[PDB]
Each structure stands twice: as structure tokens, then as C-alpha cells.
Amino acid sequence: IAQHISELIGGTPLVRLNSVVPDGAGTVAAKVEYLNPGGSSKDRIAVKMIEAAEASGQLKPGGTIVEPTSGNTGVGLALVAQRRGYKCVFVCPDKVSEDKRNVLIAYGAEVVVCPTAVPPHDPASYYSVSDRLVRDIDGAWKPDQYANPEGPASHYVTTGPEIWADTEGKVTHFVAGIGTGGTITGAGRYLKEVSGGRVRIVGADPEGSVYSGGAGRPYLVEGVGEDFWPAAYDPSVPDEIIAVSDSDSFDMTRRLAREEAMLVGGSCGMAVVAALKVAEEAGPDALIVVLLPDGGRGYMSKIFNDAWMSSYGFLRSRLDGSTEQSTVGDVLRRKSGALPALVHTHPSETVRDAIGILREYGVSQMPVVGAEPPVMAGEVAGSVSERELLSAVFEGRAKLADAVSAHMSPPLRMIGAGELVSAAGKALRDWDALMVVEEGKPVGVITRYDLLGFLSEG
Amino acid sequence: IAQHISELIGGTPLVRLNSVVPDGAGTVAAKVEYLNPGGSSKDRIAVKMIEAAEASGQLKPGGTIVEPTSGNTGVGLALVAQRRGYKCVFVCPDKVSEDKRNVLIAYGAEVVVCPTAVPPHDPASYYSVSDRLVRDIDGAWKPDQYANPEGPASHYVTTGPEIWADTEGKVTHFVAGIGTGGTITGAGRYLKEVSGGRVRIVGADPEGSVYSGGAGRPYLVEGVGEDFWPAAYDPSVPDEIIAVSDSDSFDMTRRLAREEAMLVGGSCGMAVVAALKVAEEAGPDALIVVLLPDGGRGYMSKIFNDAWMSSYGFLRSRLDGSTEQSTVGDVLRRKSGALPALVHTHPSETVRDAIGILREYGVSQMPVVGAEPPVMAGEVAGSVSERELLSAVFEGRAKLADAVSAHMSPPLRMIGAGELVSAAGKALRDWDALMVVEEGKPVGVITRYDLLGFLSEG
Amino acid sequence: IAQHISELIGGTPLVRLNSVVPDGAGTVAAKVEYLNPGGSSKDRIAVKMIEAAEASGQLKPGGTIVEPTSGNTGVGLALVAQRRGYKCVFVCPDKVSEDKRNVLIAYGAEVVVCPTAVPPHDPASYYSVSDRLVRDIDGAWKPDQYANPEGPASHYVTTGPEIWADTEGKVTHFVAGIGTGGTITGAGRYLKEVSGGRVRIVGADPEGSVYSGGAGRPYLVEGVGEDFWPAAYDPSVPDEIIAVSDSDSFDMTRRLAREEAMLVGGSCGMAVVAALKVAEEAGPDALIVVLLPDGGRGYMSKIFNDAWMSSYGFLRSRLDGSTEQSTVGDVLRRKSGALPALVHTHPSETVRDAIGILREYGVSQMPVVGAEPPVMAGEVAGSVSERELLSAVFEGRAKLADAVSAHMSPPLRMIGAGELVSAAGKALRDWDALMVVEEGKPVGVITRYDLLGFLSEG
Amino acid sequence: IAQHISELIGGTPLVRLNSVVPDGAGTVAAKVEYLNPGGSSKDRIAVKMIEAAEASGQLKPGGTIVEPTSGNTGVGLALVAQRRGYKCVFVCPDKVSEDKRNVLIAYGAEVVVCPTAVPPHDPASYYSVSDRLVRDIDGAWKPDQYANPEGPASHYVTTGPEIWADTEGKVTHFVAGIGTGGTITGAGRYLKEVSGGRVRIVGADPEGSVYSGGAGRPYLVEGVGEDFWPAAYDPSVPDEIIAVSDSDSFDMTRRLAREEAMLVGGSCGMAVVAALKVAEEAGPDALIVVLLPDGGRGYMSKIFNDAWMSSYGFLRSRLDGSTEQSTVGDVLRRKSGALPALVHTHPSETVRDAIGILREYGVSQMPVVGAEPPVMAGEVAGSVSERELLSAVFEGRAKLADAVSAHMSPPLRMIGAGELVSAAGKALRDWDALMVVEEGKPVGVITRYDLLGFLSEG
Ligand SMILES: Cc1ncc(COP(=O)(O)O)c(CN[C@@H](CO)C(=O)O)c1O
Ligand SMILES: Cc1ncc(COP(=O)(O)O)c(CN[C@@H](CO)C(=O)O)c1O
Ligand SMILES: Cc1ncc(COP(=O)(O)O)c(CN[C@@H](CO)C(=O)O)c1O
Ligand SMILES: Cc1ncc(COP(=O)(O)O)c(CN[C@@H](CO)C(=O)O)c1O
Fold first, then answer.
1. B229, B255 in Cβ contact below 8 A?
2. Distance CA B20, CA D216 (A)
């Protein structure tokens, strides 16, 4: 029946969370947005924008759209353009993980994307190339949802009224994953008029953000957060903005996924946790309507990955649930089956020999013993690093001909072998290395660098 | 309003393809299945099967589901189980690309998967471990959609009737992506009864498949195809099965994606091409209803990737559309802009020296000249491979002390330097190597192995 | 007492070989030349030539010597020049052993050496740079012992007369390591005059040499052999030249070293074998005087090395004497200690997958089995190489989508695991690879290339 | 004439140094010992000891010699044994230059050598295996020149009397390379008796040695020096021992080689410098007799090598004489002529990203700038090492989510690009790294570790 796929955007259903809402609180339903053809709630802002531009006249037939497509934007924008038969050229933060720009290309959109994080002030960055293309090409258009009233108008038309119709105006508080504006600005501006002041418009934003009255910071939840107040936003709409920490967002997303079957992204998790928190000041009998405008399936590379979420130092439970042993043993090899080798420098060898052996085996810490490595029973005397000798060879306090036995540092303390990594790092907090002994024999050396590399590798 | 996310499965919309249907043919609409909460059309089978099992009694509350989850099954099955609060244990073909099992775990399903392609006949394979777990665990259940009448029952209940309601019974031919059966069987068995013989039930299956009366073969479109006739299928339902080639399937998928904004998987492309072909024997005024029960977003790793689709030797157009130059130059380096000294071997050096130099530079073909490499003007005389000498050192027809100048093979022919890779391979069809000359000087050597490696690397 | 070190050249002693002379033959004494200050018998030519040049006038005080120093020439020539206080500039085969040019530099001789084996015909080669320097520098001199009568005159003065004095003219046959001439010419021209025709002047030269009436060939015994007859040689002096094979020369050198304590070079071994052979036609009571004008200590890198003498395919006994087990086991690893599983490709995987897996593990031959690698009991069916598929992918007789099970070559035969390498190669003469089974299981694959690499590595 | 090669040991000539003696000092002649058949002065001790043992009775015919062979011992010992037809088994300190044990094997001596520097106190070391073999094998003998009066007896018989005969007792002072004592003890004990007190017996020993009344230390001149007073030495013989520094020994050896054509080892250089110094307290008209009992040709690997003598931090002139600056440019690559990227980590990327990028490119110091690397003009603001972040990630003073712009260390100072390495290290003495700018742009980073690695690699 539908004339085109684009005419299925909207009418997103509502679900009732049952495991993410502590007992005794009112119903907290969620509006999922990944059921739309574009896979993201943004395709709505897209269609409206395209309709408005076509009705305006500044975009003649046969023109070319151009703007920095963060990623999901190209989705809806290219969808609409292909529906009507337009072109799509995207110049955005190179960030776009390979998958993002691969998908954007798949929808028939030429990309000349340029690296981000570099303030151009000249044609030497992503916004630089974007502006250069805008100046160059004819019949183009810079939608720039950041500053476009039609953006929020879209939501004011068919983003909040749908919520009212589904809930029949029986919604106490509407939280939203604040961003450029739209969703929040439009949803609040609509829900407030039809209910006077009966509804509170909450706003979720990662801590340390401008919307929360803080300072700048890097971002890990794509789409949310910003540093310069976009002209398409007005705080007068929201009642009070509630901040949320990143560490409590990804964990919330994983929880929600395992307990309510919502493979949503990160912004959805942030909104969910925010809403949850809001659900306390309002007593029971209240209906909280949260929004999850990101279906997380391309996010499965990192957010649900056990490594990427471990590099940033927050993973409160492994995906499989059950915590597992991660003995330093495998951590000590990461390639060897039994063990790599207890590299040692007998205390009679020359300092140059020790420095060379360290430079050849790629280590920055090594014990020095008298007898052979294997037979050693933990009586090692010397403990030579790599930075100390390098700082002593030039400081005149040593000479290559000198024997290492007169410059060895105090023997670095040893720790367990089968112990969990967690304790290993906890102990590493007070020392820059340690000697792992295998059942009672010095078997290897562990340094913070290696532990971090192992934990981040996967 | 919805009690749970699972209660949004069904009611998939219909779209009208406008660029994949040659003019003059009747309307060929498609039913997309990736708008469901599970992201795949299989979740409907999941819900029906779970309902039937619960109503039966063989799955008591607090039990545990267990079966080989191809990948998307893990989606719907775990969705339903989490809705009702069950467990999920999957033992399937290790195939499941990292993303597949990562997503399955994300939905809270313990996986003890096992490698596939190995006929166990004992506890040594994926089905082996599946059967062992089935025998071991209590309160379990082996759904095995392959043999479950309730599977096709679901399609017969709420998979075809929806099509009839949307089209009001005005559907000439219904093509489907025949798989373990389901849709192909349920949809036909329903549509036929309400329309007598007014509707033809077409079936799409990759060539060289049992459903098409052929021989076994590997698979590249997950879900489709099979070798042993599943007990849950009956060919008496379909009117006539139409086969399709793999090479014309992925290309069709990419085409459909770029021309109708349908980021569907591969099986969808196969079904689309099938119907497309069927749309000829039936004249205009006919209404065709194709099915695309796979939303391709996790497929973006390979199907829309420019490399994976190139390793299998079929890519009729690069994703960006415009064909690009891929001269042997970069192909000759893969790691450099200049050029590693065209590994040479003066015809006076000993054969042992040449074999050693080849073994050290990792090459299997090298020209031998008199003067220095750079100044050479294409008068190279010798052309020594690596297999010939190895076959001559042991065949008594040569000795290490011998000079290479008495065993060099005829000088291998040279080709262009800036020429496209396509011509390079076309010419390589008649020789096992060639000497690429850079503007008029022998610069490198190209062998089929290196060309394939370059084309498959990306 | 000696005014300078150079005045100790000459008066080399004579020794009696007792283990290199089969019983029943006459005494065969040897004149060692490595007891001179220069370490080589050539220094005598150096001193004579320098004396002649100084007495002539074409080399004024403060001049500069220049000529291509094969290696030991740099010894005596620089010795004399430093004695009198001259300079030394050497342009010769760059392939002059590293140790060789290091030693030459140590004696205070600037080297601008150039690569050899390249016929310059222009300023692009070792002789090219030598001639350019000769033309450029003033007060220079090109000794070029190749064409200098004073060279042989040196021997005629104080190289043969010493032999006569030591033996009192009681020498039947004098063999010598014929080279640029010198000893072979001077010694004979002197010994013949004082004994009429009582002494036969034998000449030793590696087979396939111009001096032996043969064809050109590469050289492995530095100093001996040549292709163009030097103008400083006259065959009318020698009685009859006897050729010798290289394979019987190095072995003779090692034998002599172990049985007579003569750490001499290779030319010495060739001369020794020559005389040894000559000692048969002449009955007992004859006194043979061989010459060993090369003390082999810098030759200990290769000649006495167990690897370099193995790369050229002749080593009739290991240095330690006792033959040792090699076993393909270690030959199968060459790294770590245990065999890395076994590259396997199940016969259901796609051909592209097999080619990629071969390209990633760096192998050119692999068996294909049904079950897992370890449990396999030698029932492997497929045997796919790397050249066959590459020749079949382009020959139209296969396609990447095709299954490897329809193109596998006949399963390559297996051999023993603990067997000696000797038998391994002997069997490899009839096949290009084999499957090494470890106690009854296919453990690895062995190819001629790997065996040669192992034997040449050491 | 000679019955065997061993009967040429002795009668070493004397030479007059002309460039290593200061004008105005008396003649300082040297006795070279590398003209003997064994190549070392030790062979004389070998012959004497073998004669004594044979005449004693504790070594019956058909026995087996066994003792720890340093490097030249096996030479003479095996020479004598092969002359008489004995066996040779050597268990000595490991490290023995590969060449050393290769040569020892060449003379037909089985070696079961064991690692050194490990105090066994059990069969776990070189002396351990030596003692075990001595206990095990029958008909053996432990010569142990360390404690054998016949050792010094040899020198007393035919090591000093030869000096007296050559100089006719006209020798003022005899310096010697004191080692186990044998040489010096015998020479002094003989020369003193025939001249009363007319001759001073000087002794040369590297500084920081027991013979010089100092403390223990590693050794770099093989043969000289010792820690425990050998029982075969008596200081009552020498008049006064003069010490010498290692740094002034190798340089003296190289000087002597270039200026007097004496390719002697290191101990010879030490003795020469000793005598040289002694030649001052004694006025002109004095005749000094130095000893060089080591012909350095196997030492050409390191002593005359430009790298090994550079690793130990003393090389006062390159072998070729002319100094040639080694600009940091090549030092900054060691892989090519162009620096391969420096850093693009702008002060906005996350700390985890920076640590990962450092861990991937193998660096411990990197600048952080705003714009692109190339266009940068030296306005870099951040300077992040690798140890600081690792010490801040665990110290609670930072978190992975934090931005690096709040933890960057003060920007490390820059230095020149074409400047000589010497100045580079001199400046590095005050900092642990620097930023090398290429003509005015930051091109790379230099750290002490890299400089040392470059200087030691060669
Ligand atoms: C999950 C998620 N939630 C919300 C937003 C922004 O919408 P808002 O400003 O109404 O919050 C985004 C941004 N994504 C949009 C930008 O608005 C895009 O064009 O791709 C998002 O990815
Ligand atoms: C695109 C597509 N179309 C159809 C099917 C199978 O459904 P059918 O047997 O009714 O054809 C699959 C298999 N996918 C299902 C198996 O039925 C799964 O559990 O993941 C599929 O991926
Ligand atoms: C062992 C041996 N025997 C002989 C010769 C040449 O001397 P001849 O020409 O008198 O035979 C050489 C060459 N070595 C000389 C070249 O004459 C050199 O300058 O190094 C040699 O190495
Ligand atoms: C240059 C030099 N000078 C002297 C000695 C020892 O002799 P001495 O103890 O008489 O001094 C050595 C040791 N070299 C002997 C050990 O005596 C060896 O067997 O190799 C030496 O290398």
C-alpha cells in the first residue's frame, strides 16, 4: 500500500519496562525509535526538513544536499533524497566508524569526509571542506539541523502528539535524550500546551556538559552532549535538566538489553537511567515516558564488546554474567603456551650487556640472580629497570665498562601467580612492576603497561 | 500501551519498488521484515513456537530452551524467553560471525557453541554438544524449527493473512525466500485456500540446491538453501521453484539498497531477483508480493564491503559507483610509494646464493641482469623462479656449486605499469608471472598470488 | 734486532705431513706461509714489488699506491707501504669479505671499493672506479700483480731457492697452488735451472678452469682460478697441470686441519690434494714439496663452518666427527619446540577461504580432512597445494564460489617423523612435498624449500 | 726438515716500534708471538706442559687431556696432543667467541662447554662439568696452567733466554702482559739471574685488578686480569706492577696497528701502553723489551669493529680516521631517509586513545598539537610521555574518560636536525628526550634509548 519506504516513519510503539524500574514506582514506559525504516529516530527530522525545503524553493529539483552527517543523519537524509531522487554529499567528523560511512555509501551518497578534532580556520578540516563544497557546488543546501527551526517543528508536529494520543495525555513526566534539541524542544513545547503545566519535561545529558552547566569534555555517547549552545534549542521549554554519568550509562544500556530485550544504543541508556532517577521524586501512580531514539546494532562493536568497554576502565559485569578467572598466567604470556622466559642478567655481566639484552627482549624491568633461571628459589638479589641505567649512563654516575652489580635497584617485590587480575592491578597501584613467581619460582615480570595492553586487547 | 516489546511483532508494512522493476511490468510490492522488534522475520516463528510449547506442557515454567541458533533465531527465541523469563543456551555452527554471537549474548543467552562443518558421530561437534546438553539438562526443549509444524503454522496464522488483508486478495504471485520452509509453506497454504488457484506460490533458492533439484554446494547467503529435505516442508504447496545465482543476488541486494533504500540482507536480494524474473511470464496488471525477511545491517561487514565481495570474484560495480583506477603500481607495493630494489640476481652468482636471496626476500620469481638494477633498460636475460631451482637441485640436473647462468628460464614477459588491474589479471590468465616495468625500466615482478592477496586485502 | 716487521717475511719453515699421505708413498713435506708477518705468502710479492717500484722512479716519495686488493694483497702491500710510510687506496670486488676490508682498513688504507661481477665499460664498476682513480690521482701506481714480471721475479729470487736450500735440491716434484702465477712460475723457473730436468713442476687448479683447459665457472676458493690468461704466467714452465674438484678440496682442508694441525685455507687444501694425487705416479723414495700459501683463520667463518659448507651440497663429515641425528621433527618447527598444530582446510570450505588461509599461514601445500586435526588417524582425503588453485582460478576451470572438494589434488604421500634428514631429502627427490606424521598422526607438511632453508640456516 | 709443525714454536723475532715511542726516549722493541704455529704465545706453555706430563707418568699413552680452555689454550694444547696423537676435551667459560670454539673443534677437540659466570657449587656450571668429567673419565689429566710450575718453567727455559740472546743482555726493562703470571714470572726469574739487578721486570695489568692492589671488576681484554691470586705466580719476581686503563688499551692497539703494522690483540696494546709509560722514568739509551703474546685476527670482530668499541663508550677516532658526523636525521629513521609520521594526537582525544596509540607505535614520548602534523610550525602545546600517564591512570589523579589536555607535561624542548650525534647526546645529558625539528618543523622525537640503540647497532 505504501507509496515508498519513507512513508512508514512514525507511529513508533510504546513498551513497558519491567526490570529497570525499582518496585513501588509508577509505570515508566519507553518509546523505541529503531523500528522506523531509517533505524533511527532522526529520520523524522529528516523528512520534515526535506518537505520544508522542497516547499520553500531554495532547493530546486535536481539539486544536491550537503551537510556534515554525524552518521544516523545520512541515514534519514539519504533515505528521503533517494525517495525523491536527490543526491547526498557528506563531509563530517572522520569519526564515523568504518561501518557508519560504509552504510552511508550503501544508500548512494558520495562522501568526501575529512578528519575531525582539527579547528580548520581554513580549508584544512571537515567543516572546512564542507564550507568549501557549499561555496563551490550549485543548487546545494546546508540543512544543518543544529540551526533549523523546522527540525524542532517536526517533533512538535508528529513526535509528541503521538505520545499524547497513545497515553491519552496521561503522562506525568517526559524525559528525553537531549542533544541538538528537536526531540526535547519539540516534545516539551507540544506536551506542555495541551496539558498546561501538568507535565514536567526532564532532560538527560552526560555529566560535565554545557546543557548541565558544566565544562567541556570528550564524548563517548554519539549524538548527545555539546559545547556551544545550538540556536535551535531553548532551555525555557524543559523544566529541569538532570545529568548522568557515562559509567552509569553503558552499564544501564547493557542491563536494559539483558533484562527488557531493548538492543538500544547508549543515548537510550542515558535517557533510561535519567528517567529512572526522576521516577523517585514523583510518587507512584505516575506515568513516565522515556525515549530511546537509537537502535543499537552497529553499536554492538564496542558498547556490547567486552574489550572497548574495558579500555575506558568501567565494566561492572562481563557480558556472560558470571565473573571468570583471568590469572596473570595467561596475562604473562598473551602468546606463549607455558611461559615466555624469565629474562635474567647475572650480576657479573657488564652494564652494556644488560642494557642490550633489555633492548633486544623488549622489557623495562628484570631481576638479576646468581644461578640459572629455573633452579632459582626466589633469592634474586638484583632488580634492574631500563630507565635507571639510561639515566645513569649519561649522568656520569656510571660507565658502560662498570659492572651492573654496583647499580642494581632494590629487588622488586613479588606477587602471586594464579591470582586474579583485579588484585594484580590493585597492588600495582603502589609499584611500577612486580615479579610473578610460578608456584614458588620467579617466572616473569609484570608491569602496568603490559596489564593495560592485555586488558585492552581483549 | 504494549505490555511487552514482543507484542509488536507482526503488522509489517508493504512498499512499492520503483527502480528494481523494469517498466511495462505489473506492480511488484515487497514486505519488509526488519521493522519488527527482533530485526528479523523469524521472531514471529519464535513467538508462535513459544506459545505452543507453553500451552503444551513439555516446557514447564523455570525450564531452559536449547537448540542450534543459526544467528537470527537467537534473536526472536531469546526475545520471547526474556519476555516470559526463560533461559537460552545455544550450541550452533561456530559460523555465527563475532557480531552474531555477541548480540546473542547481549540478550542474556549463555552460548557453548562448537565448531561446525565437522560430522561428529560423537561428542565432538556443534550438534554433538547440542545433543549432549539436551540429554543432560532437565526441563529443556529442542525446538528445532527444522521439524516443527507449529513453525509453518505461525506463517499460516499471521504471515499470509496479513498480506491478503493489505492487498485485499489482489495478489497474482507471491515469491518468497524459501529456507527451512516456514513462509514458503505457510504463506502459500493460506493464500491458496482463500483464492483457490488464483495465486501462484513462487520459490527462490540459490542455484545448485536441493530445493531446485540439484547437487550440494557451499552457501554464502545465510538461512537459504539446504541439503536434506526438512520434515517441515512440503513442495506440494509451491507452484514452481525458481533458482537464482549467487553472483546475481548480492549485486541485486546492493542495487536495491542504492535505488529503493532497502538495507536488506542477501536472502532478500535473492527473493527480489526471483520475483523480478517471475514478473515477465505474468503480464502487466499483476500484483506481486515479494518478502524480504532480513534487515541487513550486520551484513554490512561483508555484503556491502568492497573486499569480501571481491574475494569471491564477483563485484560488478564499486560501492561508490564510479569505477576507479587501481594501477599495478600500488599493487606492486602495498606498503610503499617508492619501490623495493627489484630483487635481482646477477647471472654470475652461484645458484645457492640465488635460492637464498629468494628465500630471504620472499619471492618466487626474479629476473637476472648484468648491470645494476636501476640503469637497466629492459635487456634482462635471465628469469629464475623458485620452484624450478628446487626441482633442479634434487633432480640431479644441477648442483649448488653450479652457476645460475646455465639454468635460467626464458625471460618472463613484461607488461605495463600504469595499467588497470583488470587487464593485469586478464593477461595473467596465460602466464604465472610478469615483469612490471616502470615507464621503461624493470621495476618489479607480479604474480597471481600477490594480485589475489591485494584484491582480497582491501 | 729487526729494523721493521716487514723484514721478517721469508724463511718459512717446512713440515712433514703424516696423516694426509697414504702409506707406501715418499715423503711429502709442506711449506707453510701463514707464519709470515702478513699472514699470507703474498706479502713477499708485496715487498719485492715495492722495492722494484722504489728503485725504478715511477713512484716518487709521498706518492699513493692504488690497485684492486683481492684481500690478502691489502695485507702485504699496506704492510710495506706503512713500513716506508706510503698510502693505500683499494678499489676491488666490494664482496671482499667484511672481515677482509675491516682488516685492510685497520692497516690504514682508505677503501672506496665498488661492487663486482658487473662489467662496467664505464665508471660504474670496481675496475671502473679503480681506473677513474688511477686517471685522477697524481703520484699513484697500479701494481696489478696480474701483469708484473717483478712479481714472479720475487719468487724466483727468494721463494724457490729457499726450498732448494732446505731440501738441498733433493725434491722430486714441487706442486703449487697455481693462481695469478708467481710461485707456480717463479718456483719452477728457479728449481728447474739448478736441477736441469730432475724436478717436475706440478700445478693445482680447481676443475673447470682455464689453466686446466676447460670452461669458465664461479669460484669458491679465493685466489685460485682465472678465466683470462694473465700476462705474468707462462705454461712452458710447469710440467703438467693437475686439476682438482672443489668438493674434494674443502674436505681435504678440514681433514688436514684435524689430522696435521694445519689451520690453512682452501687453496692450501687444493694444493695438498693435488700433490697427494701426484705422489702415486712417482714411487717411494721421492720427496714432494707442497705449498700452503694461505693461513686459514679468517676462513673459519665459512670453510670450517658447518652451514656454509652445507649450503653448497658437500659436507662428508660434521666438524665434531660423529654423525648426529637431525630428525624432521625439529626441521618441522625451526622455532618454539612443538609443531604448531597442522594447517588444515575442511573439504567443505570455499576455495577462496582455502587460498586465503594458505596465504596467511605462509604454506604452499596442505592436507584437507573431515574431522579435527588432532584426532585424525591418517585418513586425510584432500591435498591442496597453492600453485594448483592459482593456476585454476584464472584458467576458467574453477571459480571462487566453488567448493574445494572438487579440485583437491591426490593426497600427498606421508613419510616418517623421527627419520634422518638424509633419507627425507633422498625421498623428496621424487616428490615436491610430503606429509610428516607424528607417531601415527599427520603432524606437518615438509617441502623441499623448507628443507633447504633449514639446512642452510644452521 | 721439521718433524712436525709443533717443532716450530719459539724463536719469535723482535721488531722496533717507531711511531708508538715518544721522541727522545730509548729504543722500545717488541717481541711478537703470533708468528708461532699456534698463533699465540701460549703454545710454548702447551709444549712444555705436555713434555713434562709425558715424562712424568701420570698421563699414559692413549689418555685424554681435559681442562677449561679459555681461547688460545685449546690451540696449543690441541696442537701438541694431535702431534703426539692425544684427545682433547674442553669444558670452559661459555661466551667464548663462537669463532673460538669453532677453531677449537677444527683441531679435533670434543667440546662439552658450559655457561660461565654461574658459581656452581654443584654439577651446574662450566667448572662443575669440568670437575665431573675429571672424576668420571679415566686416563685423563687436568693441566690447569693456573697452578702448574712447569708453566713458568717453560718461560724460564725458552722464553726469556731467547730475549737475552737476541739483545745480548742489553735490555734495561722488560714489561709483560701479566696474566696467570707464567710469562712474566719466568721471564723475570731468568733475566734477573743473568743480569743481577740490572733489569727491571715491569708488569702491565688493567686498572682495578688484584695484581694492582684493587677491587674486582669485569674484564674486556681476554687473558689478562684475575681476582684470586693463582698459585703459579710470585710477585717477588716483578719489580713494580704498573696499571693501565681499558679505555687507553684498545685505542693503543688500534694506534699500533695503523702506525706499526702489528695486528695484535688487546693484551698486546695494554703491554705496549704500559711499557710506553715506563719508558719515561728511564732516560734515553735504555732498551725496553715489550711482549705481544696475542696476534689479533679473531679479535677483528670487535676490537677493530666500529660498533662493539662504541657500545662501551670509548672510541676516540673512527677506523677510517676522518671523523664523519652522523646527523640525527638517519639516527631518527634507522629504517629509511624520511621520518615516518610523528603524532596527530590533538589535545582533544581521550587519554585511553593516546595511551593506545603510543602502545601501537612503540614510543615513550610524543608531542600534542592542534593542527595537522606537517603544517605545524613549532607551536606544539602538549608533550605526553608514556610513563606519566601510566603513573596517573592508577594514582587516581586521572581517568580514562578524561581528556589528555588536562594532563600533558610541559612541552619538551626541541634541538637541531642536522647536528652531530655528539652534541645530541651532550644535550641529552640534561633531559630524557627532545623534539627534533626538520628545518623548522617538528619532525620526530629522540630519546636516550634510541640514541644508544643506534650507536650500538652500527
Ligand atoms: C541516539 C540519538 N539520540 C538523539 C539524537 C539527537 O536528537 P535530539 O537533539 O532531539 O536529542 C541523536 C543524534 N543523531 C542525529 C542528530 O540529531 C543524526 O542526524 O544522526 C542520536 O544519535
Ligand atoms: C532471510 C531469511 N529468510 C528466511 C529464513 C528461514 O525462514 P523460512 O524457513 O520460513 O524460509 C531465514 C533463516 N533465519 C532464521 C532461520 O529460519 C533464523 O533463525 O535466523 C533467513 O535468514
Ligand atoms: C693462498 C694463495 N696462494 C697464492 C696466491 C697468488 O699467488 P701466485 O700468483 O704466485 O700463485 C694467492 C692470492 N693472494 C694474493 C694474490 O696473489 C693476495 O694479494 O691476497 C693466495 O691467496
Ligand atoms: C695475550 C695473552 N698473554 C698472556 C696470557 C697468559 O700468559 P701468562 O700467564 O704467562 O701471562 C694470555 C692467556 N692466553 C692463554 C692463557 O695463558 C691461553 O691459553 O689462551 C694471553 O691471551
1. no
2. 89
Find chain D residues with C-beta within 8 A of C82's C-beta: 258-261
The nearest CA of chain B is from the CA of C395 a distance in Å of 6
Where on the phi/psi map is residue A142: left (φ > 0), alpha (ψ -120 to 50), or beta? beta
Query: CB B8 to CB A35 under 8 A?
Result: yes
CA B384, chain centre distance (Å)? 40
| SS3 state of residue D127 | helix
Interatomic CA distance for residues D181 and B433, integer angstroms: 69
CA proximity to C415, closest of C429, C401, C403, C405: C429
CB-based contacts of A392: which residues, under 8 Å, 6+ apart?
Answer: A398, A407
Report yes or no: D258 and C107 within 8 Å, Cβ to Cβ: yes
CB C206 within 8 A of CB C243: yes
User: Of B248, B321, B259, B257, which is closest to residue B295 (Cα–Cα)?
Assistant: B257
Q: A422, A179, A233: which is closest to A323 by C-alpha?
A: A422
DSSP D338: S
From chain A, the residues in CB contact with D400 under 8 A are 311-313
Between CA C106 and CA D320 the distance in angstroms is 8
Q: What class, spelled out in words, does domain D42-141 have in CATH? A: alpha beta
**Homologous superfamily of the C328-456 domain (CATH):** CBS-domain (3.10.580.10)
C-alpha cell at C162: 729457499
B100 noted as active-site residue:
no
- D124 contacts A429? CB cut-off 8 A: no
**A272: Cβ contacts below 8 Å, ≥ 6 apart:** A17, A20, A30, A252, A253, A256, A290, A292
Q: The cell 509505570 sits on which residue?
A: A27
Cell of D226: 684475575
CA-based nearest distance B5→chain A, Å:
6
Burial class (CB in 10 A: 0-12, 13-18, 19+), D284: exposed
Report how far ligand 1's centroid is from the alpha carbon of A248 (Å).
20
Report how this structure was experimentally obtained. cryo-EM
D57 in Cβ contact with D134 (< 8 Å): no
Cβ separation of A78 and B261 shorter than 8 Å? yes
Nearest Cα residue in chain B from A287: B1
Nearest partner of A228 among A293, A147, A302, A150, judged by Cα: A147
Ligand sitting nearest the alpha carbon of C294 = 3
Please check whether residue A14 touches B, CB under 8 A: yes
- Report angle CA B357, B361, B364 to the nearest 5 degrees: 85
Same fold, C42-141 and C328-456: no
Do A331 and A422 touch, CB atoms closer than 8 A? no
Nearest to B192 by CA among B163, B227, B230: B163
Minimal CA separation from B430 to chain A, in Å: 36
Residue D320 C-beta-side C-alpha neighbours within 13 Å: 9
Annotated catalytic residue within B31, B42, B48, B100: B42
Q: Does A320 touch chain B (CB under 8 A)?
A: yes
Alpha helices in B109-196 (DSSP H): 126-136, 150-158, 161-167, 183-195
Amino acid at C367: P
The three cell numbers of residue D99 are: 669463532
Q: Read out DSSP for A118-184?
A: ---SSSSSHHHHHHHHHHHSSSEE---GGG-THHHHHHHHHTSHHHHHHHTT--SEE--B-SSSHHH
Contact C334, C451 (CB under 8 A): no
Instruction: Indicate the resolution in Å.
Output: 4.2
* Nearest residue to A142 via CA among A73, A227, A240: A73
Q: Are strands A433-437 and A442-447 parallel, antiparallel or unpaired?
A: antiparallel
Q: Counting runs of H as helices and runs of E as strands, what totals does chain D give?
A: 15, 15
Q: In angstroms, rounded to a whole number, what is the distance separating the alpha carbons of residues A435 and A366? A: 9
- Quote the CA–CA distance of D263 and D253 in Å, as a whole number: 8
CA-based torsion, D50, D53, D55, D57: positive or negative: negative
- Rounded CA-CA distance D147/D152 in Å is 10
> Cell numbers at residue A342, please?
624469565
